[PDB]
Amino acid sequence: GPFSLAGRTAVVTGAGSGIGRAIAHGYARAGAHVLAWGRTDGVKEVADEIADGGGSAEAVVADLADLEGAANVAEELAATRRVDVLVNNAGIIARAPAEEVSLGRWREVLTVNLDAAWVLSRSFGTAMLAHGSGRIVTIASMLSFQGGRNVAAYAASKHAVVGLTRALASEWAGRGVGVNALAPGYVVTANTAALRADDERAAEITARIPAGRWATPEDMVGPAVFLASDAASYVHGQVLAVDGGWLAS
Amino acid sequence: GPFSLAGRTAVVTGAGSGIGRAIAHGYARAGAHVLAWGRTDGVKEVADEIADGGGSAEAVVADLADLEGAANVAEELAATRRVDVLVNNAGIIARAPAEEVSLGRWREVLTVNLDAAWVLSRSFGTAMLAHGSGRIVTIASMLSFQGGRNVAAYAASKHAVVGLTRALASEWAGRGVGVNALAPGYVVTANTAALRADDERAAEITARIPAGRWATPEDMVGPAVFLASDAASYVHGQVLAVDGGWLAS
Amino acid sequence: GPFSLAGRTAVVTGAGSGIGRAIAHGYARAGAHVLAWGRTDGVKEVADEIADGGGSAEAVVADLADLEGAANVAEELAATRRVDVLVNNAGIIARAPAEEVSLGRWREVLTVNLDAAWVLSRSFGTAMLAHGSGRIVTIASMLSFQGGRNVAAYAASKHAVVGLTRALASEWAGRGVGVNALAPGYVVTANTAALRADDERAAEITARIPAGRWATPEDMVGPAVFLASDAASYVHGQVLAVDGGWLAS
Amino acid sequence: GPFSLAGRTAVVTGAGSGIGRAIAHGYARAGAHVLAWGRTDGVKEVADEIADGGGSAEAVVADLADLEGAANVAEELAATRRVDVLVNNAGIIARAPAEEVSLGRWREVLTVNLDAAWVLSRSFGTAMLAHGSGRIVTIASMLSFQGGRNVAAYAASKHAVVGLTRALASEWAGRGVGVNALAPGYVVTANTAALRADDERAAEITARIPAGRWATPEDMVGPAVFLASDAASYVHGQVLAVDGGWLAS
C-alpha cells in the first residue's frame, strides 16, 4: 500500500520507551525492519517485544550525549546497512526558571535535542543521498512554536530542529530525501510525569487542549508512519503537529 | 486499518477534475463511499469512473456560487445520510493586479473559496457533531501563508479558510469532529494552466521548489486520506502543506 | 524625526472609540492631519477633541457595511486629498458557537472586517501608487493566528486581512507603498466588554498573558505610529502583534 | 519621548561593523549611552565615532566564542552598571552543503549565534529582573523561518534564538523585561559579501524581494530603536521581520 513501510529499514532513537517505543513497534507492524536505538540495554527489550510479535528488529545502544561516539555508530550503520528512514526522537527536557539555568544544563539539553539529531541526520542522510531516497522525521514540540514556561533551552532546541528540518529539506528534497518533523502536543509519558503530577498545571493544560484529552504515545504512530511512507512523497520541510488542537487554542 | 476509510461516506467538492477528482478516486480506493460534488454534469463521469473501477460513488450537481442553494443541498444530504468526511476542495482563482480588481470579482472569489466552504462545513459539521464523529478537510494553498502576485482575493480567501479550520477545530475537536486543512503547492491542473502557459514563469517556479517538480493531483491523495483516517485522530486544527518544500525555500 | 508623521494625512477607520480613537489622537500628536472615519456623527467628537488639543483633524461619516457607499467616499477622498496613510481599524466581532451562526451573521462580519478593508485599501492604495509612496496598516487580531472560541467568522476574517496584507505588500512594496498589519492582543475596549464581564473567562485570559495585564487602546499607538513612519521603511507585509506575549504563551 | 532612549544604557554586540555598528550609532542618536561590544579593538573606533558625533559610548572587547569569558564580562558589566537594553547582534554564517559540514563547524556557528546570545541574555536579563525593567532585542534572520541553502547550522541557530526569545518573553514579560527579536532580510554587509560576489545570485535575490532592493544596515535602526523604546512596551515575544517583504513573497 501507499502507507506501507515494507522493505524499509528504519532507525528510531530513544526507542526504549514512550513515543519512540510506540513508533518502533508501529514501524515494525507497518513492515519496516527496525533498529531501536537507545541509551541503555533496556532497548533490547523493545527489539525483543517486536521480534516476539512476528516483527523484524534489533537494538542499538549508544548514548547520544556522546556526539563523537554517536557519529561513529551512525556512520558504521549508514555504511553497513541500507537505512531508509531515520526518526530523531531521543530528547530530554529540563524544567527550571531561565535565571537558574547553568551553562552546563543549557548545553546538555542542546547536545541531545539538536546536536545529536544533526549528527544522525548528517550520517544517515548522506547515505540516503547516495541511494537516491530516504526519509528523516524529527520529533519536534509545541515548544517549537511557543515559549512555554521554565524550559528555555528546550524551547530553543525544539525551534532549532525545525530550522534544521527546513534547511535539510531545502537542500535534499530534490535528491530524493524527504525531511519533515512531527510535533507532539501534550503526551502521557515519562517526559511529562512532573508536569502531570502538578494537579493545577495539568488541569490548566487539559482545559486548553480542544480535543479535551492528552495524547498517548500511540497517537503519534499513524502520523510517523504517514511521514515515512510513499503517501507523503511530495511532503517536504513540514512540521505536522499532533496536538489535539493545542496550536489552534 | 489505521489508514482505511472502509465504511465511511465522504463528500468531495470540485470532484469533477484536478485535485478533487483525484481525491474522490483515492477515497474510493481506500474504501469510502464517495459523493462527488461538482458544478456541472461532468462529475457524473467521475462517479461512473469510480463505479466501473470497483468503487462506490454518486454524483451531486450544485453550483457553490449559489450559497442559499448550496446550503439546502448540503443540509438535505446531511440529514438523509451519515456523512463521515467532508473535503472542501472547490475553489477558483482570478489573476489580476489588485488595482484592477472589481468588487464583483473580489466577491466572486470569496464566495466560492470561503463562504461556500463555510456553508458546507456548517451543514455537514452540525450533523457530525450529532453523530459524535467526523472529519473535515479543507483544501488551502501556498497563498494561505504568502501573498503571491496578482491574486489578492485568492490569498485573502485561502488565509481565511485556515482561520476557519482553526476556529472549528478549537470548537469542535472535543466533540469528535477533526477539522484540518491540506495546502497544495504548485500543481499541474486546469487551475494553473494560465500560469504554466508561460514556460519561463513555470520554470522559475520549478527552480524554487526544493523537490524540483510541480505536483500532480495524485500527490494530494495520500495526505488527504491520512487526514480523514483513524491515523490522524489526534490531529486537529492543522494545515498540512503538500508542496515539495516550497514553504521551506 | 524618523518617527514623525509631520506632513502626512492619515485616514483612520472606526475612529469613534477604542483603538481607532487612540490611534487618531496619536497620529495627530505625531504631526499627521487626521481624517477620523466613523459609522456615526460621534466621530465628529474625536475630530473636535484633536482640534481642541492643537492638532489637525476632520470627521468622515460613512457606514462600512455599505461597500458601494464606502467605495464612493474613499475614492472621493483619494482623489480630493493626498492621503499618505490608511489605518483599517473598523471591525466587529460576533460571539456564538459555529453551529448557530446564520449566513447573514457570517456575511455581516466578513463585510466589515475584510471586504471594507479591501475596498479602502484598493481606493487609497491606488492613489498612493500614483504618488509613489504610502502606508497601509490593518488592525488584525490574535485570531489572525489562532481559532479562539465562538468567533469563527471573526477568526476567518482576521486571518483573511493578514492574507490581504501579504498580497498587497507583495504587489506594491516595490512602488513605494508599505502594507503591514498590527495584531492587538486582549484590549480593554467595547469589543471585549462581554468577554471581561465573564469573571472566569477574563481570569483565564489574564493568567495566560505573560505581561500579566490586558492592553489599553493607548498600548497600540506607539506601534501604529512606528508602522506609518520612515522608521519602518523596509518593513513590508508583516504582522506586528502587540499582545503582551500572548502568542508566545 | 515615546521613541526616545534618553537616559538608557544599552549593550550592543557585534558593534564593530554592519548592522551592530549602525544600531550602536542609532541608539546613541536616540539618547542611549552605548556599550559597543566587539571581538576586536575595531569597536573602539565605533565608540570614538559616536563620541565626536556628540554621543555617549564605551567599547567592550570580548570574543563571544569564549562563553566562560563572555559570561564573566557580561556578569561584571551587569553588576557594575544599570544596563537597560541588550542587543544580541553578533552572529556568523558558514556556507556549505550540509553533507560537508564538520561537527566543529556546526558547533562554531551554534556557539556564537545561539549559546552566546543565551549567556548574555541570562546575564543582563537577570539584572533587568532585579531592576524591574529592561529590553532584550535579538537579531534573528529570514533563516529563522525558512531553510535557505547551504546554511543548515545558521538556520538551526536562527530558529533557536526565536525559540529563546519566546521562552524568555513568556517567563519574564510579567516582571517588566520585554524580550523580542528583529529578523533582517538580505542586507549589504560583510556577512553577505560572499553571497553578493556572484552578481547573478544577488540579482536573483533582489528579483524576489518585493521592495526591489537589498537592505542597508541603516534599515535596521528604526525598528531596533522602536523595540527598545516605551512605544513597544506591550510588545513581547515577537519577531519583527525587516525584509522588504521577503517573507510575504
Ligand SMILES: NC(=O)c1ccc[n+]([C@@H]2O[C@H](COP(=O)([O-])OP(=O)(O)OC[C@H]3O[C@@H](n4cnc5c(N)ncnc54)[C@H](OP(=O)(O)O)[C@@H]3O)[C@@H](O)[C@H]2O)c1
Ligand atoms: N511527551 C510530550 O508531551 C512531548 C511533547 C513534545 C515533544 N516531545 C518529544 O518526544 C520525544 C519522545 O520522548 P517521550 O515523550 O517519549 O519521553 P520518554 O519516552 O520518557 O523519553 C524519551 C527517550 O529519549 C531517550 N534518551 C534521552 N537521552 C538519550 C540519549 N543521550 N541517548 C539515547 N537516548 C536518549 C530516553 O531514553 P533513556 O530514558 O534511557 O535516557 C527515552 O527513551 C522527545 O524528544 C520529546 O522531547 C514529547
Ligand SMILES: NC(=O)c1ccc[n+]([C@@H]2O[C@H](COP(=O)([O-])OP(=O)(O)OC[C@H]3O[C@@H](n4cnc5c(N)ncnc54)[C@H](OP(=O)(O)O)[C@@H]3O)[C@@H](O)[C@H]2O)c1
Ligand atoms: N493547482 C494548484 O497549484 C493549487 C494550489 C493551492 C490550492 N489549490 C486549490 O485546490 C483546489 C482544486 O483546484 P484544482 O487545482 O484541482 O483545479 P481544478 O481542476 O479546476 O479544480 C477546481 C474545481 O472547483 C470546481 N468549482 C469551481 N466553482 C465551483 C462551484 N461554484 N460549484 C461547484 N464546483 C465548483 C471546478 O468545477 P468546474 O470546472 O465545473 O467549474 C473544478 O472542478 C482549489 O481549492 C484550489 O484553489 C490549487
Ligand SMILES: NC(=O)c1ccc[n+]([C@@H]2O[C@H](COP(=O)([O-])OP(=O)(O)OC[C@H]3O[C@@H](n4cnc5c(N)ncnc54)[C@H](OP(=O)(O)O)[C@@H]3O)[C@@H](O)[C@H]2O)c1
Ligand atoms: N479589543 C481587542 O482585544 C482586539 C483584539 C484584536 C483585534 N481588535 C480589533 O481592533 C479594532 C478596533 O476595535 P476596538 O477594539 O477599539 O473596539 P471598539 O473601539 O469598541 O469598536 C471598533 C470601532 O469599529 C467601528 N465600526 C464598526 N462597524 C463599522 C462600520 N460598518 N463603519 C464604520 N465604523 C465601524 C465602531 O464604530 P461604531 O461603534 O459607531 O459602530 C468602533 O468605532 C477592531 O477591528 C477589532 O477587531 C481588537
Ligand SMILES: NC(=O)c1ccc[n+]([C@@H]2O[C@H](COP(=O)([O-])OP(=O)(O)OC[C@H]3O[C@@H](n4cnc5c(N)ncnc54)[C@H](OP(=O)(O)O)[C@@H]3O)[C@@H](O)[C@H]2O)c1
Ligand atoms: N546581512 C544579512 O543579510 C543578515 C540577515 C539576517 C541576520 N543577520 C544577522 O545580523 C547580525 C549582524 O551581522 P552583519 O550582517 O551586520 O555582518 P557583520 O558586519 O559581519 O556583523 C557581524 C558582527 O559579529 C561580530 N562577531 C562575530 N563573532 C564574534 C565573537 N565571537 N565575539 C564578538 N563579536 C563577534 C563580528 O565581529 P568581527 O568582525 O570582529 O568578527 C561582526 O562585527 C548577525 O546576527 C547576522 O547573523 C544578517
